[PDB]
Each structure stands twice: as C-alpha cells, then as structure tokens.
Amino acid sequence: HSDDKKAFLGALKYLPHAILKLLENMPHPWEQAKEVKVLYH
Amino acid sequence: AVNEFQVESNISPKQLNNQSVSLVIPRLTRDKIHNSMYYKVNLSNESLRGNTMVELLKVMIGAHLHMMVIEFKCILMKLIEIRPNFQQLNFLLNVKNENGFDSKYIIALLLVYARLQYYYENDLIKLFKVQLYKYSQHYFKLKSFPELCIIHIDELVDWLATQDHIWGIPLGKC
Amino acid sequence: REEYAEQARPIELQALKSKYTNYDHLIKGSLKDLNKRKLSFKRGKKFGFYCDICNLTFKDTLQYIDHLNHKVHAIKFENLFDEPLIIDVPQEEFELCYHNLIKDFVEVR
Amino acid sequence: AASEVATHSKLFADKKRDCIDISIFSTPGSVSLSAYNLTDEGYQWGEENKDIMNVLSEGFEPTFSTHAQLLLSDRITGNFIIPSGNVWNYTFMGTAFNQEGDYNFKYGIPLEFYNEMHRPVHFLQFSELAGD
Amino acid sequence: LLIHRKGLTYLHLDYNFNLKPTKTLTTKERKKSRLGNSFHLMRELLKMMKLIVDTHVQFRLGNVDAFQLADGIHYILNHIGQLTGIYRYKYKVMHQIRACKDLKHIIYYKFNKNLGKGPGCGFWQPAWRVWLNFLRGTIPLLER
Amino acid sequence: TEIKDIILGQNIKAPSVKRQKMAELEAARSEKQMKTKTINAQGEEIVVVASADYESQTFSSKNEWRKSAIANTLLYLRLKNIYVS
C-alpha cells in the first residue's frame, strides 16, 4: 500500500489515539527492544 | 491534475522500493526540474516518444564540452522515473571499449543512478559497485558546476559513497 | 449564398513532422533574442510561437511547450498521420539502438 | 600620437625609413594640414609597443615628429587607386578585413565613409526589422 | 492525503512533518493554503512520533550508544519548545512545556549536583508522563 | 481669445516645456483598443516572453551610422577656409 477513501474514513478518523498508545509504550532505556500488540487496519 | 477525489503529485508511478519511483528526489528540486526548460524540451513523452531508455541516452550522449556535471540533475531524474533494467545497466557500463568518448559523462550518471536505486540482483548490484570502484581507480578527470569545480573521479565516487548529500540530493547508506 | 447556409448548418508534411519531432532545433524560435517586430488564439497571431498542428501561436514559452506536453496537442499531432508518440526492451533495443548511438555519434563527430 | 606612430612603424618598419605622414585636423568650417616625419627611434618604439601602451607614449613625448614641408596647390592634380572590391572601409565588415592580406587594386572613384556599399548589414537589418 | 484532498498539491510535507511550500505563494494562494490549527497541531504530534522513533531507530541502528539515546529522548521532551512548534498552534501547551522545563531543572540538579554540568542527563520519565497527560486531554479535540 | 488678448490672457498663461512633457506622461493612451521578443525571468526560471506597450525609448543620438553619415554632407564646407601654421 506504499505506492480507497471509504475504507480510510475511520482509519483517518482516529489517528491520535494511536499516537497515544505508541508514545505510551516507549521502550525504556534499560530495554533493548519491545514486542507490542498491534491492531492494524 | 486528476479531477476526482484525489490529486496525484507529478507522475509518481511504478516500483523501486515498494513506495514510488519519484520519491527518491525531494519535492523542491524535483519540481525545479519538472518546471525547468530542459526537462520540458528534451525529455519525457513527446521528446522520447513515450518512456524510452535508449533515446533517453540519445539525449544525454547528444548533450571543450558544454554539459557540466541542471542538465545532469534532470537527465538523472528521468533515468530514475524510467527505471531501466539492471542488466541494461551492466551492458551500458561494460560495453563499447573501442571508443573513448562514449562513457565520458555517462560514468557518474550511471553511477549516481544505481547509488540512488537500492541499498543492500543484489550480487549483481555489488559487482556494479566494485566495478565503479575499479573505475574510481581508473584515474579520470571531469568538471562540474552548480560556481565551478573540477573534481577527480576518485574523489567524487569515494566522497560520494561516503557522503550524505550529493549536489543537493541526499543519499542512504548501502 | 446556399453554400454558405450549408456550411453554417506529403513529403513536405513529413519534413514538418521531422521538425516538430526533434526539439533541439524546435527549442529555438528566439534567434531574434531582443528585437522589435512591427506587425483568442486561432490561425496564428503572425507573431509569437508557432504551433501549426492545432494552428495556435503562443506569446510565451511555457505555454508553447506546456501545450505541446498537453494531450490535446499530441492527439492532433497523431491525427495528422500516425501514433509514434505513444510508441519491452528485449536487449536488442540497447544493443542495436545503442550501437547506433555510438555509430551515429562518431558520424556526427 | 601613439595609435598613429605605432601604425606608421608597422607599415614602414624595414621598408622605407624616410617616408612621411599627413595628419589632417578636421573641424566644421576649416581643415588644417599638419605634415610629419619620423626618425629611427620611433620605428623601434612602434615595433616594441603595439597594443595599448599609453605610458610609453607619454614618455615617447613630442619626440620624434619633425614637421615636414607640405604645400597645397591648384597648379597640379591627381588621382585615386582603390581596392578591387571597391569597399575600402571595413568598419561593419569585421570578418572580411585582414590586417596582413593580399588585395587587387584598380583606379576609380572612392565612396563615402557611410555609403550604401559600406553599410550592407543595415539593409538586412532594415528589412529584417519588419521581417520575412 | 488530506492535503491533496484539500485540492492543493504545492504544500510539501517533509518526512519530518515540517510543512513548507514548493514555490512562492501569491496573495490568493496563501489564503487557500491556510489550514486550521487542528491540522498543523496533528502534524506537530506526528513530528513527536517522528523524532522519538528516529532516536530509537538510530539506537537499533549501530550509530549511537544507549546513554546518548536516553539523553536524546530527554533532550527532545524537555526541548519541545525550541525543537517543535506545538505551542504556536495551541498555547495551552506552554503549561506543559513550562512544567517540562521545571522538572527539567530539578532533575539536572539532583543529577548534576556532584558530577558537573553538560549533556548526558537521563531519566526522561517525568516530562514523558507530562506529555502523556497532555495527549489524553488533547486527543478528543483532534479526533473531533 | 480676443477678450483675453485685449485685456489679460490670464497673464498670458502658457504651460512650459516641462508641463507639456509631463502632460504627455500623465495622459493615458487615448485609445486603449508593435511586439518585441524578450527573454524574461520567472520565479526560479528563465522564459522567453513577448512584450508590449512601450519599451521603445531609444537614445542612439550622436552614434552609429545615422548622425555621422548625415553629418558627412557638410564636409565640403570644411575646405572653404584652409590654413596651416
């Protein structure tokens, strides 16, 4: 999908709730890499 | 532009790292080229009879020498947008040893081209790079303009692969 | 009068083709550079930039070339004769064509 | 002056030492005939100093132009020789003039400095003004 | 997508989300190119995303040691004011930023008391909690 | 004009040469309804542009062919008086 609007209605509708969760889950400096659950469109 | 429900920036077609071909070059410089005279005259569909790599080479080969390494930015950009075959890159690189005026300014053109293409067919690309290293050892001299600076192929190839930005276009690390 | 009411209700062309195809010669209509010339775009203004395909003349360069890059001018250019503008690479393209680029390049040089 | 002496020297360097010059001063209402000679030092100066050389002209100084003896008479008359092309003034023909080059010559009547034969470029520019 | 949907293609978004036009704008163009503070704000938050995720990328990438990573995040979250323009599009963020600087100073003291002064102060926790407590408030605003 | 001639003429009011040329510059081109080829620079661009109105002011006074060539006719007058020191 790198290179339909009706399907992007809700996806574009809530961007920032994803910014919240992601910025909330930041790997802490004592943790190399963090596996995380993801709900994607 | 396109009328309905979307506006497509430039052509932005095809392939080359899963997103788009024209994304390799910034919007500002890309629109400087697409708004430049040379691009609208000697290139694209009406000049090249649609996308044609060999006639695209007819333009650059057709161009003391007047062409200095604007025109280079443009011809490189159309090389990008057309995106010919890596095999054709191999031939165009290694053929025609019976004439010395053929690859003159084509060297750094086919070079910066593959420099923009991909970062790691893979082994063939690596052979292309090490061959470009051999030509960096070939001790060649050329002139370049934006000011005026003459630079040696050994300095521009090594300084280019080691350097982030080249003549305004950024590069990634292979 | 009746005819009026009804209306209300070669090789040189190939040379013209050879002109409007190669731009390097077409690029320059500016040979006058800075010069004073004494005398709805249709059938030419007797000045400006000449497009014979659609019979329009354009006072500026970006309009003359931009119109040429436009589809309609290409559609008319094709409807004149053929469709080369729309016209793979099975290696014979760069082998034979590229070899013709070296050969013709040496011929010109 | 320098532009004159250098030219004199270039013409007559090894050819004739005692040849003279007629410098005609011209202004509206009257003209004046100022004749001059040249010594052997001026030829050397012209040989060395051709292009520019304003300071060495200053040092050159009034010397050496010795005032030659010239007379003006109605008791004799004379004639002109002109080049075969009959264009002596190459002002606007810049490519055709050659400072050392051979030309055929003939007797005839010379033309005006600005005359139709000497100004051909103007006609192509004149008709080119309207164009076509 | 939203910019092209707006019908203007000449506003360029950097991959860092910095918005700059392609060419100079006429009086008519500027008015049409003006977008609400909502959009600019969302862009700024996506620039937070881009900055911190860039830092962690260059950590996973072999560029930088972990110390300069934690100093990286720290520098971001405290330096938001100079390094990002959220305060312009919503000024109530200054309460956050002013609070971020405050905790900032505190940490530096407790961190820099014996050792000295300079870069390398870690412990980005409190300013980061401040920012999460900013998002939880400003999310319904931008979603709406 | 007969009255103003017998008595005043408004102190014989004549707009001077200045006021004439400036009255020309002020006046609009009476009837609003040549072409010159020029090279012009758009934003970050160079474009050949056809121009209009008046660029046509030209000086070329004492120089080139015209003034000296016209001045050449008077040269027979320079030999009426001829003298040398």
Ligand SMILES: [Zn+2]
């Ligand atoms: Zn046309």
